[PDB]
Design a protein around this ligand. Sequence first.
Ligand SMILES: *[C@@H]1O[C@H](CO)[C@@H](O[C@@H]2O[C@H](CO)[C@@H](O[C@@H]3O[C@H](CO)[C@@H](O)[C@H](O)[C@@H]3O)[C@H](O)[C@H]2NC(C)=O)[C@H](O)[C@H]1NC(C)=O
Ligand SMILES: *[C@@H]1O[C@H](CO)[C@@H](O[C@@H]2O[C@H](CO)[C@@H](O)[C@H](O)[C@H]2NC(C)=O)[C@H](O)[C@H]1NC(C)=O
Ligand SMILES: *[C@@H]1O[C@H](CO)[C@@H](O)[C@H](O)[C@H]1NC(C)=O
Lengths: 96, 181, 180
Amino acid sequence: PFLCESEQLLIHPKEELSRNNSMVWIVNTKDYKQGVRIEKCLKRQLGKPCNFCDADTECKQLFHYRTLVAVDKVTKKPYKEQVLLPSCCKCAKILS
Amino acid sequence: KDLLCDFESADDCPKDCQCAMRLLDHTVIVNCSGRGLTEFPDLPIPSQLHEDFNALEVHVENNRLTKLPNLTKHNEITQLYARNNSIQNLLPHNIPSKLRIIDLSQNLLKMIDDSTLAQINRSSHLETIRLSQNQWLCDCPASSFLIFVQQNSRLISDMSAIRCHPSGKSLDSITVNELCF
Amino acid sequence: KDLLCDFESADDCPKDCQCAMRLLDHTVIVNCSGRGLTEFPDLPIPSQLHEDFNALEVHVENNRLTKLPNLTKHNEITQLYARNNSIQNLLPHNIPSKLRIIDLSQNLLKMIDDSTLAQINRSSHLETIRLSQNQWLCDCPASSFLIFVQQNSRLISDMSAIRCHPSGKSLDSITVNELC
Ligand SMILES: *[C@@H]1O[C@H](CO)[C@@H](O[C@@H]2O[C@H](CO)[C@@H](O[C@@H]3O[C@H](CO)[C@@H](O)[C@H](O)[C@@H]3O)[C@H](O)[C@H]2NC(C)=O)[C@H](O)[C@H]1NC(C)=O
Ligand SMILES: *[C@@H]1O[C@H](CO)[C@@H](O[C@@H]2O[C@H](CO)[C@@H](O)[C@H](O)[C@H]2NC(C)=O)[C@H](O)[C@H]1NC(C)=O
Ligand SMILES: *[C@@H]1O[C@H](CO)[C@@H](O)[C@H](O)[C@H]1NC(C)=O
C-alpha cells in the first residue's frame, strides 16, 4: 500500500479534426491513442493527512519539468521549452 | 433518423441519385429518384465508406423501371421501394432473400410466381411489404397468390389496398373456390 | 401476475383443479391438472368487486373427450382451452357471449352447426379460434362451414393449417362444392 490515494490517469493526445470533411470517418484513430500517463491524489481529492502515519502531514501533489532546447533551424534565437506534468503525489511532514 | 452526411467523398455514386450515408442505421443510402435512370442503377457495394454500413437502402421512385435486374449477388440490400415504376411481372432473383423491406407502391404489377414467392417461407430478415395501388390479375392462378397473401397477412401492410385488376376489390372477399367458381 | 394469493379461499374450482385469480390479467385460470374427467365446474366467479376478477380460462384442455357444456353462458369465460380430446359436437348455447378466444387443437372437426357461426357476432365481440389436428372429415354442409371459415379468414386464426381426412391437406385449398 501507499501513504496517499494516488491514481494513475491516461490523457489522450489532442486529436486533430478534419472538419473540412463533412463525410464521416474512421474512429480507428479515435480507437487507439498513444496517450500520456499522469498521477493525482483523490485522497479526499488530495486532502488526506496520510492517516496511518500519525505525524502532522498533508499529502501534496508534485510536478516534473522536461527541458527540450534546440537552436532554431533558421538560426534564430535558441528555443527552450519546459513542459510541466503532474508526476507524483507524495506525503510530507509539517510543523505546528 | 435524419442525421445524414455526404457519401464518403466517393465518386461511386450513380449520376442522378445524389446518394448519401447514414450512420445511425449503418445503411449506405442511394436516392435515385424522379426517373433518375430508366434502367435500375448500379449497386455500390458497402466495401466503400471504410467497408462499413453493411445494410444498403435503394430509393428508386417515380422511375420508368420495368425489369428488376436484382440478383442474389446483391445480398447487401436491406430495403427497396420501386414506388411508381412500370413493372408488369417480377423475377424470383429480382427480390433478394436478405431484403428486409420492399414496397413497390402504385406500380404496374399484376402477376406472381410461386417460385418467386418461395421466400414467403421466412427469410433471414422479416420482409415487411406494402405493395398496393396496382391492378393485379384475377384467376385460379391468382387464387394461390390470394391464399399466400391471406396466410402471411402480418408481413403485408394491408389487404384492402390490393385490388382485382378488372374490378378493384379487397382480395379478402374471395375464397379460392369463388375465383374457381 | 400473482395467483392463489390474489385468489381467496372461496374455491369455485374443485380441489382437483388449482383455480386462482390474477390481478392485472383480470382473469381466473382453472389451471386444472385432471384430463378426461368431468367438466370442471369453475362456473362461480368471485367478482371480488374489482376488474381483476371478471375473466376465466381452462388449462388441462383435455378435461373431457366431450366438450364442457357451458350452458351458463357466463360472461366470465373469455379464453377457452381444449386439446388432446375427441370433441365431436359444440353447443352454441354453451358458447358464452363475452367469450373472446377458443381452440380446437388436437380435436376432431366433423360437420359442426351453422348456428355456431350465427351465434357469435364479430361486431358484438372479436372472435379468435384455434383449429388444428382436426382429422375428422369434410362434407357439403361442412364445405359450407369451411367456406364460412374462409370468409371469416381473420376470425379463423388457423385457417392455414385446418385439414380434414378426405382433403389430405388444408381444408380451404379444396372447396369444390360438387364433392361433399
Ligand atoms: C430523394 O429524391 C427525392 C426526389 O424528389 C426527394 O424528394 C423530395 O422530398 C422533399 C420532402 O417533401 C421535398 O421537399 C419539399 O418540397 C416542397 C415543394 O415546395 C416544399 O414545399 C416542402 O417544404 C419541402 O421542402 C422535395 O421537393 C422532394 N424533391 C427533391 C428533388 O428534393 C427525396 O427527399 C430524396 N431523399 C429521400 C431520402 O427520399
Ligand atoms: C398453473 O399454471 C401454470 C402455467 O399455466 C403451470 O405451469 C406449468 O409448469 C410445468 C412444470 O414444468 C411446465 O412444464 C408447464 O409448461 C407450465 N405451464 C403449463 C400451462 O402447464 C402450473 O403447473 C399450473 N399449476 C397447477 C397446479 O396446475
Ligand atoms: C394432452 O394429452 C394428455 C393425455 O395424455 C392430457 O393429459 C393433456 O391435458 C393434454 N394437453 C392439453 C393441452 O390438452
